[PDB]
Design a protein around this ligand. Structure first.
Ligand code: NDP
Ligand code: NDP
Ligand code: MTX
Ligand code: MTX
Lengths: 166, 166
């Protein structure tokens, strides 16, 4: 039942970030993020955390990965290496969602059970892309859904759930 | 020539914020913001400062308004009340841009020489509205320009420059 899942959103070319934030705004996609991670743990890099104004998502067990030994935010648990997070994960039952920052996605690739990827049907300008060396072939699409754009969500997008091929 | 200017962006209903961020993403509008405030000073409330990850913008003198006893913060100047900012402003020659936070906009409205308002032609969900306690009759629109929507900027928007008359 328990698993480590990577979840991210990207444009048509793999863009995931710009100026420490996301180069788009789609409340409906954020809603999907909320429903998926609700009542679970999420691990994000220190940069992405600061990028979102250090906001603590309600009903989410927030885990921050940093190399700063003096880093200490109230409301969140700090981790300084991958092994530490894996030990934490094994000592509990909740699913663990790798939520972001290209470096974090790269660091956890070997331990991923599944990926939930949102393909935004648009092309934007970004300075950070999903890891091009990430081997998505080891995964298989189990389900997906198309979300039609509207006033508040200017770009169409699709969400795919892909499990690790046996 | 020097003056105190308020700059902000709002949707058709006056929405300026949602969950401590701006409910939209328009690189061309952010480029506009940079062109306007570049090489000058900008004053933002502590909330907004936190909201953008304490990210210090380049070629900008950042001023933070807060009641927090702290005498200083980052590579920024800390102020503890409205009058303090106005006095600092009087002792120098650069234009002062009031850039954000509903409370900060409201606090400096009586001292504004000009407003530069971006009118985003769309309706989005906000939890923070521009504090419109301005006697509009006091200002005159010198000009406004239109920016047609495109792939990276999904909403049309108009930037209006208004100066205090009489
Ligand atoms: N589109 C999407 O789905 C998402 C996009 N993003 C975007 O991606 C960009 C951020 O990505 P990125 O720049 O890679 O930053 P990350 O979010 O990956 O964070 C990087 C930081 O994590 C810490 N870190 C990294 N590796 C380790 C390690 N092995 N051990 C301990 N600490 C480590 C360090 O923090 P420290 O420097 O403190 O030591 C490092 O600076 C932003 O634009 C963000 O908005 C983020 C999430 C999702
Ligand atoms: N659309 C746009 O153009 C912009 C929108 N925004 C949005 O506005 C929202 C934030 O607005 P708001 O919540 O009002 O926060 P503000 O950014 O206005 O910051 C408020 C804080 O400033 C300090 N402060 C306020 N008044 C005084 C005073 N008289 N003397 C000393 N310090 C004072 C306090 O900080 P402390 O609590 O530390 O004492 C107060 O909590 C966010 O959603 C943000 O995204 C922000 C900028 C632009
Ligand atoms: C920057 N950032 C990270 C971010 C954004 N979108 C993503 N989208 C996906 N698919 N995957 C991610 N890792 C992801 N990460 C953010 C920023 C804000 C919120 C946020 O406010 N989320 C609300 C939901 C907002 C809503 O319901 O519209 C929540 O409670 O989770 C989440 C992630
Ligand atoms: C949240 N926030 C405040 C914000 C955003 N847009 C605004 N837009 C207007 N017109 N007025 C404001 N006061 C305003 N404030 C931000 C967030 C990021 C950047 C920013 O990255 N600015 C870069 C430009 C980034 C870009 O060109 O993409 C700069 O150097 O000014 C500015 C303000």
């Amino acid at each position: 039942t328990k698993k480590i899942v990577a979840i991210w959103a990207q444009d048509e070319e793999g863009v995931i970030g710009k100026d420490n934030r996301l180069p788009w705004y789609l409340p409906a996609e954020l809603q999907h993020f909320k429903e998926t991670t609700l009542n679970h743990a999420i691990l994000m890099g220190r940069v992405t955390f600061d990028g979102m104004g250090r906001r603590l998502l309600p009903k989410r067990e927030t885990l921050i990965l940093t190399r700063n030994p003096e880093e200490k935010i109230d409301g969140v648990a700090t981790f300084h290496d991958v092994q530490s997070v894996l030990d934490w994960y094994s000592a509990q039952e909740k699913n663990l969602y790798i939520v972001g920052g290209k470096q974090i996605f790269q660091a956890f690739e070997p331990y991923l059970d599944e990926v939930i990827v949102t393909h935004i049907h648009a092309r934007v300008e970004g300075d950070t892309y999903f890891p091009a060396e990430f081997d998505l072939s080891l995964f298989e699409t189990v389900s997906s859904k198309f979300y039609t754009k509207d006033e508040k969500n200017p770009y169409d997008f699709t969400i795919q759930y892909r499990k690790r091929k046996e």
